[PDB]
Design a binder for these strands. Structure first.
Ligand SMILES: [Br-]
Ligand SMILES: [Cl-]
Ligand SMILES: [Cl-]
Ligand SMILES: [Cl-]
Ligand SMILES: [Cl-]
Ligand SMILES: [Cl-]
Ligand SMILES: [Mg+2]
Ligand SMILES: [Mg+2]
Ligand SMILES: [Mg+2]
Length: 736
RNA sequence: GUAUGCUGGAGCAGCCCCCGAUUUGUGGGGUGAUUACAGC
């Protein structure tokens, strides 16, 4: 259980993880800070306060030195325990505690209730098993950390606790596909589109399978932006960065940083079109984006982009003649413009009615959904109620502090917070008191829904229109608003549809299907069609509309994938064989009985195994020597990668048991001012021939680093030396 | 394609509802604003 209890061969699971951390720190020395900041690039809200961010920026050498120390400690029989001590002082400990409390908050606030406690990373000034798992997570792919946590967790008795604890501890891991030698990003986009399309649409997964992976995210926009930029040099989409409780989202059109994220806000992007006399910039929604993709795929991209470019000219012409212009042109103009010219004004009475109906509706739905809502949703509602009853509104610090109480199921500390607001005369005794009779987030949430609905279902008074936001003093000149509007134009919904398919009776989905059937690809989605329709419910009920739209956008993504593959160098486009339901690629090695690997649609998440071609070649050659031609991924995993992993555990356990026997038999000691005995210095004191010591070191190094850089004869010699020193294992290697 | 505080503008965009509909509609109505916005 404690980290001290892992001695000799029991260290093996840590040996494998930490050697991979060093394997990966040799590919990229920046991984500690990269991993700590990965999520915070996507957050307006600071993951870290200012001094924590400062510590993180300085920490690479410290963290890289600790990574090497622990790898040394876990890769030796006996190493000084000093490396397992982090003082309260320690930069790395502060960083780790902040990153971990942030990951726990991120897990808890997406749950509907707080069920479990999380393990401590430290006990006194000593790292725990959970602390060691957390430290290594920063350097390794998800699959390495899952393998470590699976070996060392005491929590697997409770599946829910095991997986939530794992979620927190693995928050900062690398994606399984993090490292590649591929230089053509069209190769990686091809794989990413295929992986996403092979994930089952969430709603269909829950119906057919609810208790391939589940699709969790819609990546249509991301893919569409990469495809439109690759096809149309005139077009460039806004990239996001955050300038540093809250940072500033800045949108720019700099391409220089390949991996920089596109700006996507509520299914809107910013497009810059460089035609004629200079660039023009628009906001474009999903609706216009998906029609632009459809038009681009059919060869009308240049024409569509010309019509978007000219859009601003039409708006500027209409703006001078709003009173007299055709009512059909009112669609391009925001409310404030039409209302300034006496078009579609509403009586304050009507504005009150619509506003109060809406806010009433919002709170009746919250009241009905309390048990299904997330802790973050419930906490935000409770905080809105307290904030709207405060003499002076929460500052960011006050808000954050109370949010942390509510998300953490700390109802005592939340109620101590209300007491402090009461003693400060910020809220009156009634507001403090309505919470006195509650002990749970759900109870508090119901009380708040009831207080708000009581306020909203009063016979309309002056206090009510202020409460629902109709009381604000607008002091901005119409002419300032018009000027702002002209530098921030958004494309009217249905614009491209009306320009190209005016008299079409075919919806978006049928237009996509007609292009797929007649366009010349003869491809369709590889997922079973039942994943895009529930036959048992009506055409328009529940998820069926959303799944039907998903079939059309997946078909767009397949055609984008077709464009990317078709665009890559013929050397690479001609080796691969892509069917509706499979990808076949050649495996290196196995000369005489040459080989290919066949990924089914359910395996497209694993196409990253192609990034280490030498390892896949040796896995097939050494674990599957008799197989020739086409091999299923499933077979490569079960007979190859799983077989390798089983052997690797036995060789690492063997090597550590060897060190223990040879250090204690030959009664060995460390140098004065050294932490462990070099494995060289241990072999130097063996009864082995040179050829035996060479092979032992090479086979050891291979299993420590997860590769196959040795020959079958050299494993023979390793196996001989283990047998000669008492440590046998059922190697099951070499293979029949 | 997470509204973690407050002020003010913006709902052409995004999203929702009603109506229509082998489905995502330049039909109708909303959206106490999500922000290529300006401030505390
Ligand atoms: Br290899
Ligand atoms: Cl990553
Ligand atoms: Cl490449
Ligand atoms: Cl009121
Ligand atoms: Cl098999
Ligand atoms: Cl070799
Ligand atoms: Mg405001
Ligand atoms: Mg609107
Ligand atoms: Mg605002």
């Amino acid at each position: 259980l404690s980290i001290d209890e892992y001695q000799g061969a029991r260290k093996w699971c840590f040996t494998i993880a930490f050697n991979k951390a060093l394997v990966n720190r040799d590919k990229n020395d920046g991984l500690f800070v990269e991993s700590l900041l990965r999520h915070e690039k996507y957050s307006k809200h600071d993951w870290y306060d200012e001094d924590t961010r400062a510590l993180i920026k300085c920490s690479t050498q410290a963290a890289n030195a600790k990574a090497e120390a622990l790898a040394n400690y876990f890769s030796a029989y006996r190493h000084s325990p000093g490396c397992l001590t982090f003082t309260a002082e320690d930069e790395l400990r502060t960083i780790m505690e902040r990153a971990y409390e942030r990951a726990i908050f991120e897990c808890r606030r997406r749950e509907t209730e707080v069920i479990i406690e999380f393990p401590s990373l430290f006990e006194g000034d000593r790292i725990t098993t959970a602390g060691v798992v957390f430290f290594v997570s920063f350097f390794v792919e998800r699959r390495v950390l899952d393998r470590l946590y699976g070996a060392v967790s005491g929590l697997k008795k409770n599946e829910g606790q095991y997986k939530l604890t794992r979620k927190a501890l693995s928050m900062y891991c690398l994606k399984d596909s993090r490292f590649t030698k591929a230089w053509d990003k069209r190769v990686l986009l091809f794989r990413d589109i295929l992986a996403q399309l092979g994930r089952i649409p969430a709603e269909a997964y829950e119906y057919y399978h609810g208790e391939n992976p589940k699709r969790h995210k819609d990546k249509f926009i991301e893919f569409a932006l990469h495809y439109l930029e690759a096809q149309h040099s005139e077009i460039c989409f806004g990239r996001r960065h955050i300038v540093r409780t809250k940072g500033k989202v800045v949108v720019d059109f700099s391409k220089k940083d390949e991996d920089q994220s596109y700006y996507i806000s509520k299914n809107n992007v910013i497009v810059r079109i460089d035609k004629n006399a200079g660039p023009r910039s628009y906001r474009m929604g999903l609706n216009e984006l998906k029609y632009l993709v459809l038009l681009s795929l059919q060869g009308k991209g240049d024409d569509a982009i010309a019509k978007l470019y000219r859009y601003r000219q039409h708006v500027e012409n209409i703006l001078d003649v709003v009173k007299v212009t055709d009512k059909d042109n009112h669609v391009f103009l925001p409310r404030f413009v039409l209302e300034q010219h006496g078009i579609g004004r509403k009586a304050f009475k009507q504005r009150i009615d619509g506003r109060v109906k809406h806010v009433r509706g919002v709170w009746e739905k919250k009241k009905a959904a309390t048990n299904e809502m997330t802790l973050h949703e419930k906490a935000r509602d409770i905080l809105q109620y307290v904030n709207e009853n405060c003499t002076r509104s929460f500052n960011p610090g006050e808000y954050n502090r109370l949010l942390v109480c509510l998300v953490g199921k700390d109802v005592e500390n939340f109620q101590a917070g209300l007491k402090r607001l009461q003693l400060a005369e910020r809220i009156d005794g009634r507001v403090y008191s309505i919470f006195a009779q509650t002990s749970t987030i759900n109870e508090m949430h119901q009380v708040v829904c009831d207080q708000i609905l009581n306020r909203l279902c009063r016979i309309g008074d002056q206090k009510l229109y202020d409460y629902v936001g109709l009381g604000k003093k607008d002091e901005i000149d119409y002419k300032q608003k018009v000027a702002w509007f002209k530098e921030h134009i958004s494309i009217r919904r249905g614009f491209l549809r009306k320009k190209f398919w005016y008299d079409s009776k075919k919806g978006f989905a049928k237009l996509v299907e007609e292009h797929l059937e007649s366009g010349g690809g003869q491809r369709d989605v590889g997922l079973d069609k039942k994943y895009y329709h529930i036959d048992a419910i009506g055409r328009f009920e529940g998820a069926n509309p959303a799944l039907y739209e998903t079939l059309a956008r997946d078909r767009l993504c397949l055609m984008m994938a077709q464009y990317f593959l078709g665009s890559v160098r013929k050397e690479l486009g001609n080796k691969i064989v892509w069917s509706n339901d499979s990808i076949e690629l050649p495996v290196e090695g196995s000369v005489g009985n040459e080989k290919s690997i066949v990924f089914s649609v359910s395996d497209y998440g694993k196409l990253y195994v192609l990034d280490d071609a030498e390892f896949l070649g040796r896995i097939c050659e050494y674990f599957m020597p008799h197989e020739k031609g086409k091999i299923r991924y499933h077979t490569v995993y079960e007979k190859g990668f799983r077989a390798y992993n089983d052997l690797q555990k036995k060789c690492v356990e063997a090597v550590l048991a060897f060190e223990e026997k040879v250090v204690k038999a030959k009664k060995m000691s460390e140098k004065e001012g050294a932490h462990y005995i070099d494995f060289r210095e241990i072999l130097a004191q063996t009864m082995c021939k040179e050829a035996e010591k060479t092979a032992v070191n090479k086979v050891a190094r291979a299993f420590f680093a997860h590769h196959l850089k040795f020959v079958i004869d050299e494993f023979g010699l390793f196996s001989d030396v283990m047998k000669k020193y008492g440590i046998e294992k059922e190697w099951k290697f070499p293979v029949k």
